[PDB]
Amino acid sequence: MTRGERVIAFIERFCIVPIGQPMRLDPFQKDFILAVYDNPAGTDMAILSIARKNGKTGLIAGILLAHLVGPEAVQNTQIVSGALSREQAAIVFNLAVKMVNLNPKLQEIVHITPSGKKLIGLPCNVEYKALSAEGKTTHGLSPILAILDETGQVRGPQDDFIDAITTAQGAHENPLLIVISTQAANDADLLSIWIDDAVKSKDPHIVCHVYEAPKDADISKRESWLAANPALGTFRSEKDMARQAEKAGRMPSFENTFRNLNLNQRVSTVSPFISRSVWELCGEMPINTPRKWYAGLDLSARNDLTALVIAGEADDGVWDVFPFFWTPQKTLEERTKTDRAPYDVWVREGLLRTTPGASVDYSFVVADIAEIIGDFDLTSMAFDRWRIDQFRKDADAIGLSLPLVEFGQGFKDMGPAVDTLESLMLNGRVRHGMHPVLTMCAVNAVVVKDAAGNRKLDKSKATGRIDGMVAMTMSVGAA
Ligand SMILES: [Br-]
Ligand SMILES: [Br-]
Ligand SMILES: [Br-]
Ligand SMILES: [Br-]
Ligand SMILES: [Br-]
Ligand SMILES: [Br-]
Ligand SMILES: [Br-]
Ligand SMILES: [Br-]
Ligand SMILES: [Br-]
Ligand SMILES: [Br-]
Ligand SMILES: [Br-]
Ligand SMILES: [Br-]
Ligand SMILES: [Br-]
Ligand SMILES: [Br-]
Ligand SMILES: [Br-]
Ligand SMILES: [Br-]
Ligand SMILES: [Br-]
């Protein structure tokens, strides 16, 4: 009998639905459990993505209890569930408590703490805590198992709460992270990045079962509903799906909610930024003649590739673009191989610049910029709105005054700048001199478009670096 088959057996033997009947897992739930636990390579992370109301809470509770007192229970450990809100943490906790108190065989080996959200599986001394990003940071945190609940609600590419849990698991040799969530609405959101990385890499240590209706599928058809709702008829009401599908049809402002929540689709779109052929048509060398010069600086990727772009409109219609790049010296040989880009050759050829260490040293970047801006009277320099004072202080510290203007890295501020840049490329109004590094960034660039029509470049969607294009977008955007 397999490890996964034991979890299933445990859930179906000891877990009772709250009403009355013993829990019977659907094939999609079983197949997910089998894939996680009977992975011969070992599973580090497991993602199951399904539409709303397909039995998430029950499955989370079942798996927790298998680890609390069932066949996965191991001595003196902690297990956690993590959600964004108190409410969500209570829902999972309350369902687990009800399961514990509906079966005397579970009831008789679990102690519940009279404050907080904490269960102890007594036989193996397993502590279970229900956590949320809302409310107090708990002191003792070191989970061998963490189930993240509805992580698709995270809007950034990062979240402090998720990272705290992730970091805490790092104390153990081979911990398990399980994510059960409806997809994020946007391709740039944390869960979308996790799913995409798993799907593109086919990493043997990652399981990723995603149930979604295809993009072009008819929202009123049952086969579209089944594709996103694998529990259609058992846990998920088909009557309710039919009502929500009709509402989506009659209310266009509800369609995106229906698509995300009930068809498990992302509502954003993704495409390449530019073809090499179109890019190459703007590759005549740039000139430096007096004008309003605008700068865009992207230092964000401190371990990979930093970029400054100075650009400005000539007396003809055309924009001349001068890019400068910084990269860490220690990790140059490693990254050349990792990224499959000739960074070594470019540094040697004076087209890429280094900073000592594994990180990009701000001190060395501002020193070069001072030499660079000797040839440019800048009107503005666009920079991350959240890190502008820290860079302004470090620039001022070396005697270098820069006309810094705040520039958002999200969809609202990038949207118009991407549209402007695209429009200039399309009518041949750029001279970039086929700079190899910028060209690499252009060709790697992917653009995510949100539901409101705002476009931005995505470093996670792209294979290889794109940081020159972010700086070029900001540079254009600053006018
Ligand atoms: Br089975
Ligand atoms: Br819902
Ligand atoms: Br749900
Ligand atoms: Br066992
Ligand atoms: Br355990
Ligand atoms: Br509840
Ligand atoms: Br909580
Ligand atoms: Br916490
Ligand atoms: Br939820
Ligand atoms: Br990959
Ligand atoms: Br339902
Ligand atoms: Br798409
Ligand atoms: Br200046
Ligand atoms: Br200045
Ligand atoms: Br923004
Ligand atoms: Br334009
Ligand atoms: Br969106």
Looking up residue 47, the CATH number of its domain turns out to be 3.40.50.300
Among all bound ligands, the one having the nearest atom to the CA of 461 is 10
Question: How many angstroms is it from 168 CA to the middle of ligand 15?
Answer: 31
> Is the residue at 136 inside a domain?
yes
Residue 231 CA, ligand 11 centroid: distance in Å: 9
Q: Closest-lying ligand to the alpha carbon of 196?
A: 10
* Tokens standing for residue 195: 């799913």
Note whether residue 150 is domain-resident. Answer: yes
Answer yes or no: are the C-beta atoms of 351 and 324 closer than 8 Å.
no
CA of 69 to the centre of ligand 5 (A): 7
Ligand nearest to the CA of 50: 3
What CATH number is attached to the domain comprising 380? 3.30.420.240
Distance 6 CA to ligand 2 centre (A): 31
Quote the distance between the C-alpha of residue 98 and its chain's center.
34
Beta partners for residue 82, in sequence order: 131, 148
- Ligand 8 centroid vs 199 CA: distance in angstroms? 29
End of a domain among 210, 233, 259?
210
Report whether 443 contacts 271 (CB < 8 A). Answer: no
Q: Based on the fold, state whether residues 45 and 138 are members of the same structural domain.
A: yes
* Cα–Cα distance list, 335 to 7, 147, 299, 303 (Å): 42, 33, 17, 10
Q: How far is CA 394 from CA 141, 300, 307, 398, in A?
A: 36, 15, 17, 7
Please state the three-class secondary structure of the chain as a single string.
CCHHHHHHHHHHHHCECCCCCECCCCHHHHHHHHHHHCCCCCCCEEEEECCCCCCHHHHHHHHHHHHHCCCCCCCCCEEEEEECCHHHHHHHHHHHHHHHHHCHHHHCCEEECCCCCEEEECCCCEEEEEEECCCCCCCCCCCCEEEEECHHHCCCCCCHHHHHHHHHHCCCCCCEEEEEECCCCCCCCHHHHHHHHHHHHCCCCEEEEECCCCCCCCCCCHHHHHHHCCCECCCECHHHHHHHHHHHHHCHHHHHHHHHHHHCCCCCEEEECCCHHHHHCCCCCCCCCCCCEEEEEECCCCCCCEEEEEEEECCCCCEEEEEEEEEECCCHHHHHHHHCCCHHHHHHCCCCEEECCCCCCHHHHHHHHHHHHHHCCEEEEEEECCCHHHHHHHHHHCCCCCCEEEECCCHHHHHHHHHHHHHHHHCCCEECCCCHHHHHHHHHCEEEECCCCCEEECCCCCCCCCHHHHHHHHHHHCC
Q: How big is the chain, counted in residues?
A: 479
Residue 54 CB partners (closer than 8 Å, separation 6+): 211, 229, 230, 231, 235, 236
Residues 304 and 155 in one domain: no
User: Do residues 105 and 190 share a domain?
Assistant: yes
**Residues 346, 420: one domain?**
yes
**3 state SS for 100-130:** HHHCHHHHCCEEECCCCCEEEECCCCEEEEE
Contacts of 453 (CB under 8 A, 6+ apart): 415
Ligand index nearest the alpha carbon of residue 430: 16
Q: Which ligand is nearest to the CA of 57?
A: 3
Method of structure determination: X-ray
Asked if 283 and 399 sit in the same domain, the reply is: yes
Contact criterion met (CB below 8 Å) for 327 and 305: yes
Sort residue 171 into left (φ over 0), alpha (ψ -120 to 50) or beta: alpha
**CA-closest candidate to residue 261, choices 10, 50, 27:** 50
Give pairs for 331-338: CB < 8 Å, separation 24+. 331/303, 331/358, 335/304
Q: Has residue 231 been placed in a domain? A: no
Residue 405 and residue 409: Cα distance in Å, rounded?
13
Identify whether the C-beta of residue 426 lies closer than 8 Å to the C-beta of residue 418.
no
Cα of 60 to ligand 5 centre, how many Å? 14
Q: Give 258's contacts (C-beta < 8 A, 6+ positions apart).
A: 219, 244, 245, 247, 248
CA–CA distance, 47 with 79 (Å, rounded to integer): 17
Q: Which of 210, 227, 255 is the last residue of a domain?
A: 210
Q: Does 38 belong to an annotated binding site?
A: no
Contact (Cβ atoms closer than 8 angstroms) between residue 357 and residue 330: yes
d(CA 320, CA 315): 11
Judge if 70 and 187 occupy the same domain: yes
CB neighbour list of residue 269: distance below 8 Å, 6 or more residues apart: 187, 448, 449
Which structural domain, as residue segments, surrounds residue 358?
276-477
Collect residues with CB below 5 Å from ion ligand 5: 67, 73-74, 77, 126
**CB count in 10 Å sphere of residue 184:** 24
324: left (phi over 0), alpha (psi -120 to 50) or beta: beta
CA 236 to ligand 2 center in whole angstroms: 11
Sign of CA dihedral 142, 147, 151, 157: positive
- Total domains in the fold of the chain: 2
Question: How far is Cα 65 from Cα 63, in angstroms, rounded to an integer?
Answer: 5
Ligand 5 centroid to residue 91 C-alpha, Å: 21
* 215 within some domain: no
C-alpha 176 – ligand 15 centre gap (Å): 34
Q: Which of 152, 186, 210 is the last residue of a domain?
A: 210
- φ, ψ dihedrals at 379, nearest 5°: -80, -50
Phi-psi region of 340 (alpha: psi -120 to 50; beta: other; left: phi over 0): left
